[PDB]
């Protein structure tokens, strides 16, 4: 009701110029909610403007601002370029302790200090961070962002401890207060602990908060797929979450996450036909979730539908956070069944093993599915000498990792003497291999004496080229 | 500095590990290369361009780690399989297959000498294999989760591990013990390089943090920040000079070694490269990734 | 085969975090 | 469901040669989902459709929700649950041509389906995977709808 008059407005004078200054500012200042490279174009003529009545040096706010943009674009290198002037032309207000060019250095600093988390040049970031609070140790962000440096190295560190001391300098603060329980997510052991660390601002002063009540939805689905639901106390979980959902449903109906979650809960529930709708929504919404990825091609092979999900799998490996995640070439390898479903199949599970070579899992996913090819090619097969060779030694291996994960006490929850029956399949594969054996000697045989007989006819034509020549 | 040399499509399937030998044993001349598709391509680099001597295979499962002997012509190959074959290259053979049974293998090491086989196992030992025998000789016990990276120090006095989730153990090679057990890092560490004196070590984690540590006295020398996804290998440039760091984001920076600086990164694979090495002065640095095509860095 | 993989499926969901975004004076 | 195809596409050009037909514009969109290109030819006097927009198309051999098959015939007077409710443009037309990148001896890996619905062209060309739902000389539709 102010916003898009002031639009209409800033659209008014944009194409005038009653000596425009100004305009192009607040053009920009209500622009970086909105598409960013208006304010951009807005900053650019804005950097002009300034020199023509006077060669005026654009003032340091504008040019921490165009840096900031640059931020959340790819103009990450001329962003640092801009922080830099910034931080001089601040130095230029040498005098302006009104104006505090001081404190705007001092923002102007955690802004270049999070681009350098961007360059990833934490050594420098740490530098600025540590400049900005040992002189002004009131601040949090500097703070918490140093913490959540040392949370990217781990939980334990002085990344807790910052972040529980800037509860200790401002527990009201509600992000740094999320982000403790953030740390606690990691400890999922600590699920039902997190009622307690997720309360403490639920006071109604921060109340109402979206992002607390869907982590609590989250923490309280994390609880589902558990032999539990039908002693009703997953269904009772499924329901609570259920209420969660309701109450985000009703508060906002255009939270995504929150629908997420109705979706996935009604997965758990077996509505799966009712669940790729309500994931087609946040899927025009924003394709840009990693969630929503994995549960549509849950659906899809629920359908076995394989061909629309794999595919999706691997769209979901489009982004630039972990060359071999684990968990989603888990949910790629589910009911795979064809050709590239097997091998290419292993290939996936090599790809993982070879980062994750500690999982028993991984380790029993192979065996299966070299046991499932080893019998792809040995039962109306009738094939090739080199693959039933190759298959012996596949199922021998096949075989030594039945007997390894056995050795082994800790599973998955669920124990795996279900490699012994592996094993007495392996050894009537053992029979059946050697069955098969003196077939290929068979088949080698007769390719033998066939091409014998094409030698010999070959050598009659030549005999039909000498009468021909005589 | 450049590249001189992109090899297209060099593998069938992803490469996991490199082996440039560095002696004038006709090593120079050649690189071996270790992949899944479970060729060992024994690549000649010849007249300053790179062409196949063997492809060398058996290795029933990708390969994780190749290596050139310092003192030998020959070469050795790991993988899943947990049979380490050992390969003679002047003719393309297979010496022998180490069984390291049932599945407790991992990553080899040639010796300075070339006559010990270190490689990582399941249970925290580090298992020590005769290049004649292919027998455990004994295993260099230090317990912890999983033992990820090993690396000989050169001048042959010391051994370091990394283990699966940070843990760096410090080995008097000449007696087999335990010096320093040493936890600068927390998450998994794939690649450590002793230095060409022996006298620093490198870290290669999953946090982008090379932390330089210094192996007489073993305390840090110093943390350096790197790329945005995990770096996973490393070499020094063997002048001791330089070293190289290839990690998961399609992007291998150049460091320097005194002053913390990427004195150059290279972006040239569109896929996640996995192993690094240089010349025998640093000049030429090999470098390999999912891309299956091989890209040689002249870095004067 | 006799059965199909193993897993243990769910139906997760995760979290964005702080965004911190570079401030704008 | 009688659905042979469902993405998700992004209008990254719209005529490139140029405008040839008033009523009708050439679109040249990339879905994100499975990366499958798509040159379609819409009416755009009815349905307009402007630069960067996106859109979820779906091609199908039925617009009936319950697997039936279709008479190719008119039927205005239709009280059955059609799928085309769910959808703003819709079209029908028929595949004239699958072609792909198959040697004499190995198989496609990409496919490209054309489709001609009365004249209005349009090609889906991708990987193979995506594109077995479709057999030349079949009638299918378009179903497709505009999303912010």
């Not at chain 1, 028993?360 to 996913?365: Q, R």
Request: proline share 3%.
């Amino acid at each position: 009701e102010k916003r898009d008059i002031a639009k209409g407005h800033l659209k008014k004078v944009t194409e005038q110029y009653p000596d425009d200054v100004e305009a192009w500012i607040e053009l920009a200042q209500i622009l970086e909610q909105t598409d960013i490279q208006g304010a951009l174009s807005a900053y650019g003529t804005a950097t002009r403007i300034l020199q023509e009545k006077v060669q005026a040096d654009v003032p340091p706010e504008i040019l921490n601002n165009v840096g900031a943009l640059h931020f959340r674009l790819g103009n990450l290198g001329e962003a640092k370029k801009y922080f830099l002037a910034s931080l001089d032309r601040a130095k230029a207000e040498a005098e302006h302790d009104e104006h505090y060019y001081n404190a705007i250095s001092v923002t102007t600093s955690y802004n270049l200090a999070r681009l350098y988390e961007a360059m990833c040049e934490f050594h420098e970031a740490e530098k600025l961070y540590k400049n900005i609070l040992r002189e002004h140790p009131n601040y949090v962000d500097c703070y918490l962002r140093l913490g959540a440096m040392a949370r990217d190295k781990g939980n334990f560190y002085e990344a807790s401890d910052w972040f529980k001391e800037a509860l200790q300098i401002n527990q009201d603060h509600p992000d740094a207060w999320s982000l403790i329980g953030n740390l606690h997510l990691a400890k999922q052991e600590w699920g039902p602990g997190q009622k307690k660390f997720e309360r403490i601002l639920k006071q109604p002063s921060t109340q109402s908060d979206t992002y607390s009540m869907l982590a609590l939805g989250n923490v309280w689905l994390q609880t589902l797929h558990q032999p539990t639901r039908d002693r009703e106390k997953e269904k009772r979980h499924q329901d609570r979450a259920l209420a969660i959902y309701k109450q985000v449903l009703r508060n906002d109906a255009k939270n995504l996450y929150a629908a997420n979650g109705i979706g996935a809960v009604l997965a758990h529930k077996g509505y799966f036909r009712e669940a790729r709708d309500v994931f087609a929504q946040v899927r025009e919404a924003t394709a840009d979730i990693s969630d929503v990825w994995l549960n549509l091609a849950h659906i899809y092979v629920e359908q076995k539908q394989y061909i629309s999900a794999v595919q999706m799998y691997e769209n979901c490996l489009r982004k630039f956070y972990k060359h071999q995640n684990t968990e989603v070439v888990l949910y790629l390898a589910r009911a795979l069944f064809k050709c590239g479903k097997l091998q290419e199949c292993k290939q996936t599970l090599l790809k993982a093993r070879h980062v994750a070579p500690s999982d028993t899992v991984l380790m029993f996913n192979v065996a299966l599915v070299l046991q499932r090819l080893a019998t792809s090619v040995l039962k109306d097969e009738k094939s090739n000498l080199k693959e039933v060779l190759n298959a012996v030694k596949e199922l021998e291996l096949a075989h030594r990792y039945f007997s390894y994960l056995s050795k082994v006490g800790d599973k998955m929850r669920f124990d795996l003497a279900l490699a012994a029956t592996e094993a007495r399949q392996c050894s009537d594969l053992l029979s059946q291999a050697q069955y098969h054996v003196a077939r290929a000697r068979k088949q080698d045989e007769e390719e033998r004496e066939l091409r014998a007989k094409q030698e010999q006819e070959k050598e009659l034509l030549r005999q039909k080229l000498l009468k021909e020549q005589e | 500095y450049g590249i001189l040399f992109k090899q297209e499509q060099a593998h069938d399937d992803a490469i996991w590990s490199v082996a440039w030998g560095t002696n004038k044993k006709e090593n120079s001349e050649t690189v071996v290369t270790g992949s899944l598709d479970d060729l060992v391509k024994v690549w000649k680099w010849r007249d300053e361009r790179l062409d196949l001597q063997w492809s060398l295979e058996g290795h029933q499962l990708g390969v994780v780690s190749v290596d050139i002997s310092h003192t030998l012509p020959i070469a050795a190959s790991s993988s899943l399989d947990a049979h380490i074959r050992l390969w003679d290259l002047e003719n393309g053979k297979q010496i022998k297959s180490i069984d390291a049974g049932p599945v407790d293998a991992w990553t080899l090491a040639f010796s300075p000498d070339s006559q010990y086989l270190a490689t990582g196992t399941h249970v925290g030992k580090v298992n020590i294999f005769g290049v004649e025998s292919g027998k455990k000789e004994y295993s260099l016990d230090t317990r912890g989760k999983f033992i990820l990276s090993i690396a000989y120090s050169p001048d042959g006095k010391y051994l370091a591990s990394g283990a699966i989730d940070g843990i760096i153990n410090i080995f008097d090679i000449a007696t087999g013990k335990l010096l320093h057990t040493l936890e600068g890092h927390a998450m998994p560490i794939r690649s450590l390089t002793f230095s060409p004196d022996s006298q620093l070590l490198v870290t290669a984690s999953d946090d982008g943090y090379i932390k330089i540590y210094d192996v007489q006295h073993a305390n840090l020398a110093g943390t350096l920040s790197g790329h945005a996804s995990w770096v996973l290998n490393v070499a020094f440039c063997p002048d001791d000079t330089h070293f190289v760091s290839s990690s998961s984001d399609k992007s291998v920076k150049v460091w320097d070694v005194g002053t913390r600086t990427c004195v150059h990164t290279f972006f040239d694979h569109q896929d996640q490269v996995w192993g690094v090495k240089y010349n025998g002065n640093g000049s030429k640095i090999v470098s390999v990734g999912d891309d299956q095509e091989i890209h040689i860095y002249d870095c004067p | 085969e006799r059965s199909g993989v193993v897993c243990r499926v769910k139906y997760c969901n995760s979290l964005p975090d702080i965004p911190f975004d570079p401030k704008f004076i | 469901a009688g659905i042979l195809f469902e993405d998700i596409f992004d209008v990254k050009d719209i005529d490139p040669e140029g405008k040839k037909f008033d009523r009708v514009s050439r679109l040249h969109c990339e879905s994100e989902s499975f990366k499958m290109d798509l040159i379609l030819d819409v009416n755009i006097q009815i349905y307009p459709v402007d630069l960067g927009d996106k859109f979820r198309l779906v091609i199908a051999s039925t617009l009936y929700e319950d697997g039936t098959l279709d008479d190719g015939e008119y039927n205005p007077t239709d009280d059955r649950p059609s799928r085309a409710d769910q959808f703003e443009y819709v079209m029908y037309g028929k595949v004239y041509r699958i072609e792909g990148d198959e040697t004499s001896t190995e198989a496609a890996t990409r496919l490209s389906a054309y489709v001609s619905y009365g004249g209005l062209l349009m090609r889906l060309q991708g990987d193979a995977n995506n594109l077995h739902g479709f057999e030349v000389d079949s009638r299918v539709y378009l179903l497709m709808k505009k999303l912010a």
